[PDB]
């Protein structure tokens, strides 16, 4: 979804 | 001033304002039943948005948002918490009207003030990239159920991105720092709520059976299972055997040899387990090996090219993987934006001003990862690797590759998750040894790999580049200089060429005619610089499940659509009882 990397750190 | 009930990043949304449900759901799907899923590794907290920790499965989905996206479109937004929005044609401001029925799980309303609180919570205690992206934006409750968003520059995608922001209850989150891990679930709002867990071992979600938004068009026919349980496995081979024994219900198979040879047993002969291969023609996740180009060993493009020549994909595919895989070759894989042809005139206009800082192949050739004869000893590729190494100052001393000045051996560490099958690793290490290069293999646990990945504490490590259906402004988080610490810039690149192309992509958002040459141009820059070593993908989903579910006639494009499945009583009656587990 558009914007997810703006909100949280990378995982997996 | 326009008023709308749906938005699309490019073009127009597929579903009219009067739409009843998505094409890919059964509106009459019955509620009930449980689906049990696996997860690899471990988890230690419930806060997906923290600055540290290993967040539990599904904890990115605890909250409703203003608008939610359809799964059969690249970026179209439909009402969830919001009912509608008024906006200017330049997308520099929007007023979002909040549905008066919106509720958190404790029955309290979701208000404009909660949206304003949430924006400020992320600005002040969220990950660093949030404040960098939204420094010029304000989010204000201008009436009890109207939030006004103002952008300092026209930014349709910035605006739609905030439509996907989880809306936090101020009454809970005023007492918890957003950057801190959470030992217990936060107060939330979505259709599933955590109701039990065992730290590191399992998380159980229950359907919120009076979910306020259950009958909104975007939710009709979805969220059908009464229980969604995740069991954690440290070892995918243990998870696979547990699946076949009935320990969980559904498996996405990423291991080629498993799929080819190991879906056997009387549970298969008795037809308790279904196998499906769903081909897809859409944007594709791709696997790469990231080079950390901030480390001296990988600072030289020639060394990265040489090590890429040593990766014999054709041998791996044939000998290990039943030729299941396709070679990764683009950061817009299987879309219109992949640079599959020579540059056209518009691309040359964008690239020619930067030719001093571009590999010449950007203009003269179509990018193609190395192809081997497939026997592990491709003479042409390995001689070219040796010449590139020599030219880069890495020469043979006996059988060992050493720096021509310092005499230091060429050696690097491959960081790997212990949970993954990695049958390609020793073949790669062997090929490198035959160039005189030492690759140390370091397998680590799930929490360690998460921490090291985030800090780029590796020479090389595998990374997934998630499917990007168009050149999104989110490219800046993963590639632009200013977002180097976002945890998404795997190679550690800070390049003005990349920065300028992504600045142009952002300025051209919504404009497909401009985005097409810009996406292809960016693909050329990212691929020809060998920032990562392309591995593989496959344009299909290999799924297996115990035969207790039914599915809508239509599957979504951009998701498996498991949230549209339902528990089928007739089918489950022929399966053995779960009491045996
Ligand atoms: Cl249907
Ligand atoms: Mg920073």
């Amino acid at each position: 979804v558009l914007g997810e990397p703006r909100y949280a750190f990378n995982f997996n | 001033i326009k008023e709308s009930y749906a938005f699309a990043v490019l073009g127009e949304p597929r579903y009219a304002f009067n739409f009843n449900h998505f094409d890919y759901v059964n509106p009459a799907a019955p509620k009930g039943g449980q689906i049990t899923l696996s997860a690899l590794g471990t988890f230690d907290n419930f806060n997906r948005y923290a600055l540290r920790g290993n967040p539990g499965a599904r904890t990115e989905q605890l909250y409703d948002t203003l608008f939610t996206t359809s799964d059969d479109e690249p970026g179209s937004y439909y009402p969830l918490i919001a009912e509608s929005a008024r906006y200017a044609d330049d997308y520099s401001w929007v007023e979002v009207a909040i549905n008066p029925r919106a509720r958190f799980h404790d029955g309290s309303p979701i208000t404009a003030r909660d949206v304003e609180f949430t924006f400020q919570k992320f600005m002040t205690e969220g990950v660093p990239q949030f404040r960098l992206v939204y420094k010029g934006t304000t989010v204000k409750a201008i009436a009890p159920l109207t939030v006004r968003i103002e952008l300092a520059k026209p930014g349709k995608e910035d605006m739609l991105s905030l439509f996907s922001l989880p809306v936090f209850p101020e009454k809970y989150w005023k007492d918890h720092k957003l950057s801190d891990p959470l030992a217990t679930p936060p107060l939330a709002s979505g259709p599933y709520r955590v109701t039990s867990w065992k730290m590191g071992q399992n998380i159980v979600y229950s359907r919120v059976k009076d979910y306020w938004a259950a009958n909104l068009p975007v939710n009709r026919g979805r969220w059908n299972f009464d229980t969604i349980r995740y069991d954690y496995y440290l070892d995918d081979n243990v998870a696979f055997e547990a699946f076949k024994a009935g320990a969980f219900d559904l498996r996405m198979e990423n291991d080629a040899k498993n799929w080819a040879t190991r879906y056997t047993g009387k549970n298969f002969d008795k037809k308790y387990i279904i196998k499906d291969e769903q081909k897809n023609e859409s944007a594709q996740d791709t696997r790469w090996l990231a080079f950390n180009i901030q480390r001296p060993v990988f600072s030289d493009r020639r060394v990265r090219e040489a090590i890429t020549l040593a990766f014999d994909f054709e041998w791996m595919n044939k000998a290990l993987f039943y030729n299941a895989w396709s070679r990764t070759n683009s950061y817009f894989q299987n879309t219109e934006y992949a640079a599959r042809n020579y540059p056209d005139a518009a691309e040359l206009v964008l690239l020619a001003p930067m030719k001093k800082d571009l590999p010449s192949e950007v203009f003269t050739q179509i990018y193609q990862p190395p192809v081997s004869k497939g026997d592990g000893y491709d003479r042409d590729n390995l001689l070219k690797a040796d010449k590139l190494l020599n030219e880069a100052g890495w020469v043979l001393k006996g059988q060992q590759r050493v720096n021509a000045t310092t005499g230091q051996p060429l050696s690097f560490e491959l960081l790997l998750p212990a949970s993954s099958n990695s049958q390609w690793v020793l073949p790669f290490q062997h090929s490198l040894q035959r160039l005189g290069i030492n690759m140390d293999i370091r397998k680590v646990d799930n929490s360690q790999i998460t921490n090291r990945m985030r800090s780029r504490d590796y020479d090389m490590m595998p990374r997934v580049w998630r499917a990007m259906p168009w050149p999104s402004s989110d490219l800046q988080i993963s590639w632009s200089s200013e977002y180097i610490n976002s945890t998404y810039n795997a190679p550690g690149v800070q390049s003005p060429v990349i920065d300028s192309l992504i600045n142009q992509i952002i300025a051209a958002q919504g404009n497909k005619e401009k985005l097409l040459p810009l996406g292809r141009a960016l693909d050329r820059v990212l691929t020809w610089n060998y920032y990562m070593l392309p591995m593989w993908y496959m344009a299909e989903d290999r799924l297996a499940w115990w035969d207790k579910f039914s599915q809508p006639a239509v599957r979504p494009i951009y998701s498996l659509g498991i949230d549209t499945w339902w528990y089928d009583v007739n089918k489950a009656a022929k399966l053995p009882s779960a009491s045996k587990q």
Side-chain angles (χ1 to χ4, degrees):
Chain A
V1 187
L2 186 58
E4 292 158 320
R6 312 175 169 204
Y7 310 156
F9 275 164
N10 209 0
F11 201 30
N12 278 343
Chain B
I1 310 202
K2 314 173 33 185
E3 189 165 65
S4 305
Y5 307 89
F7 300 87
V9 298
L10 284 174
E12 297 292 322
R14 158 178 317 184
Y15 293 93
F17 81 98
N18 65 338
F19 91 111
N20 184 274
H21 59 266
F22 289 130
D23 285 359
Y24 50 86
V25 306
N26 170 14
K31 314 291 172 175
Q34 160 169 341
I35 184 170
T36 304
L37 308 164
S38 63
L40 293 189
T42 195
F43 75 103
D44 51 40
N45 79 107
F46 289 99
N47 183 4
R48 182 65 186 90
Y49 315 102
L51 289 180
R52 68 179 170 97
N54 268 55
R58 219 190 173 86
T59 58
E60 83 282 6
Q61 296 183 55
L62 305 184
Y63 290 97
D64 290 332
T65 64
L66 291 174
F67 292 78
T68 194
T69 51
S70 66
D71 287 338
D72 61 356
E73 302 174 83
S76 290
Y77 293 73
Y78 302 95
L80 181 42
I81 293 170
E83 287 195 277
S84 61
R86 297 170 67 246
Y87 58 103
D89 308 64
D90 68 339
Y91 295 95
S92 65
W93 65 266
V94 60
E95 293 182 357
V96 184
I98 304 303
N99 192 320
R101 301 190 183 283
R103 301 287 182 267
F104 297 108
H105 286 159
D106 69 347
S108 64
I110 308 178
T111 70
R113 170 52 200 175
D114 289 308
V115 183
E116 173 182 341
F117 167 82
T118 298
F119 182 68
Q120 279 307 317
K121 193 68 158 173
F122 274 95
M123 287 296 293
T124 56
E125 299 171 4
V127 291
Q129 58 265 38
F130 189 99
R131 47 196 94 186
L132 284 178
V133 160
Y134 293 111
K135 203 165 187 187
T137 301
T138 59
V139 177
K140 201 212 185 199
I142 62 173
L145 300 176
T146 302
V147 191
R148 181 163 160 118
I149 304 175
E150 298 185 335
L151 294 67
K153 285 303 171 74
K156 192 175 184 196
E157 293 200 1
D158 279 344
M159 180 179 297
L160 305 180
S161 283
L162 293 174
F163 289 177
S164 296
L165 191 73
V167 180
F168 290 159
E170 176 172 9
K171 60 183 298 179
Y172 171 86
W173 275 101
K174 65 185 182 60
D175 291 316
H176 301 275
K177 276 193 40 102
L178 189 56
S179 47
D180 281 340
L182 278 175
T184 59
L187 177 67
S189 60
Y192 287 91
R193 181 171 72 84
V194 178
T195 54
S196 73
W197 69 90
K198 173 167 192 193
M199 201 53 91
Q201 305 228 10
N202 71 71
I203 307 170
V204 181
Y205 289 88
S206 298
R207 187 166 72 83
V208 176
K209 303 209 171 172
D210 60 350
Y211 173 52
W212 74 271
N215 204 42
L216 292 185
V218 297
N219 290 325
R220 292 203 181 112
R222 300 168 75 206
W223 324 121
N224 303 309
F225 299 114
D226 276 355
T227 302
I228 299 172
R229 178 188 166 115
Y230 296 89
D231 288 335
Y232 276 75
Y233 291 82
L234 296 184
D235 185 326
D236 193 51
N237 289 310
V238 177
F240 175 46
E241 292 162 21
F243 170 73
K244 289 189 297 188
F248 56 97
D249 297 324
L250 170 65
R251 175 163 168 95
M252 311 68 149
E253 182 59 73
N254 284 324
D255 187 84
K257 192 209 198 142
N258 281 350
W259 193 254
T261 67
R262 295 193 169 129
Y263 278 70
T264 67
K266 254 61 93 154
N267 279 336
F268 293 93
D269 310 322
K270 294 322 150 214
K271 285 104 181 84
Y272 297 153
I273 302 182
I274 308 296
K275 282 199 325 130
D276 203 21
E277 293 180 28
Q278 323 178 330
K279 320 284 182 175
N280 37 60
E281 280 47 80
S282 56
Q284 289 297 311
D285 288 354
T286 53
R287 298 161 168 86
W288 306 71
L289 294 164
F291 295 107
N292 186 344
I293 72 173
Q294 299 174 324
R295 302 244 165 130
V297 65
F298 293 145
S299 68
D300 191 321
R301 173 172 180 265
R302 290 169 297 195
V303 171
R304 303 197 299 271
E305 184 180 355
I307 284 157
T308 302
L309 282 154
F311 189 99
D312 195 327
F313 172 72
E314 281 67 38
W315 181 85
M316 295 173 183
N317 214 17
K318 169 191 81 184
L320 310 172
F321 301 141
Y322 300 77
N323 279 323
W325 298 106
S326 301
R327 192 76 193 269
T328 294
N329 62 13
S330 159
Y331 288 95
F332 302 97
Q333 192 81 54
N334 214 17
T335 77
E336 284 200 323
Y337 303 98
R340 292 177 298 130
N341 213 359
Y342 295 99
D344 68 2
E347 288 172 78
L348 292 174
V349 166
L350 301 165
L351 294 162
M354 302 184 297
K355 66 203 246 204
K356 65 218 169 322
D357 300 305
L358 291 164
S360 71
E361 294 89 2
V362 162
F363 303 92
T364 65
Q365 297 179 40
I366 300 176
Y367 171 73
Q368 220 65 79
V371 175
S372 169
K373 43 191 110 152
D375 66 0
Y377 285 72
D378 190 282
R379 293 279 50 193
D380 294 334
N381 289 346
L382 292 177
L383 299 147
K384 182 174 182 186
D386 172 63
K387 294 201 240 233
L388 290 164
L389 288 164
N390 289 345
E391 288 163 4
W394 294 98
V395 306
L396 279 191
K397 195 192 280 253
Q399 322 139 56
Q400 188 183 48
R401 184 79 53 177
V402 312
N403 190 273
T405 302
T406 77
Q408 250 183 240
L410 202 177
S411 173
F412 71 93
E413 179 191 64
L414 172 62
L415 183 70
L416 294 172
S419 70
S420 66
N421 282 303
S422 54
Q423 305 89 330
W424 52 271
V425 170
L426 280 195
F428 188 34
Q429 183 187 62
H430 293 156
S431 180
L432 293 166
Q433 205 261 333
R434 278 184 276 116
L435 290 160
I437 294 175
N438 173 255
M439 178 181 77
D440 293 316
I441 297 154
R442 184 81 189 91
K443 294 193 122 203
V444 299
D445 58 69
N446 192 227
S447 287
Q448 297 186 17
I449 189 96
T450 297
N451 297 338
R452 295 187 55 170
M453 173 271 288
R454 281 174 177 173
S455 282
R456 204 179 302 103
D457 187 10
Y458 53 82
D459 294 332
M460 176 184 288
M461 88 164 280
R463 301 292 291 259
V464 175
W465 176 244
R466 265 140 80 210
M468 204 178 271
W470 82 101
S472 171
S473 58
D474 277 358
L475 284 162
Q476 68 193 321
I477 310 298
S478 294
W479 294 108
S480 295
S481 295
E482 192 177 45
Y483 291 97
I484 185 67
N485 312 316
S486 64
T487 69
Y488 296 94
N489 186 319
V493 58
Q494 297 184 283
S495 153
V497 174
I498 293 175
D499 293 350
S500 162
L501 290 177
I502 293 186
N503 288 342
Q504 297 175 63
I505 280 169
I506 287 164
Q509 59 188 269
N511 190 324
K512 182 169 172 174
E513 173 170 1
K514 311 212 273 142
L515 289 165
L516 193 61
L518 277 163
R520 298 173 176 169
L522 180 64
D523 203 25
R524 299 181 200 283
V525 177
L526 299 175
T527 56
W528 277 118
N529 273 289
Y530 315 136
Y531 291 131
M532 313 208 272
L533 205 171
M535 296 175 79
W536 42 76
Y537 72 99
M538 62 168 73
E540 70 188 50
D541 299 295
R542 300 171 151 193
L543 293 76
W545 60 92
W546 286 75
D547 192 22
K548 54 172 55 165
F549 307 119
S550 276
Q551 297 84 30
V554 174
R555 214 260 300 180
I557 299 164
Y558 291 98
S559 142
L560 303 179
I562 310 307
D563 46 297
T564 75
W565 294 18
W566 60 96
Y567 187 85
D568 188 317
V569 181
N570 302 315
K571 289 177 190 189
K574 310 154 309 161
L575 298 182
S577 162
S579 46
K580 303 184 103 204
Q581 305 298 314

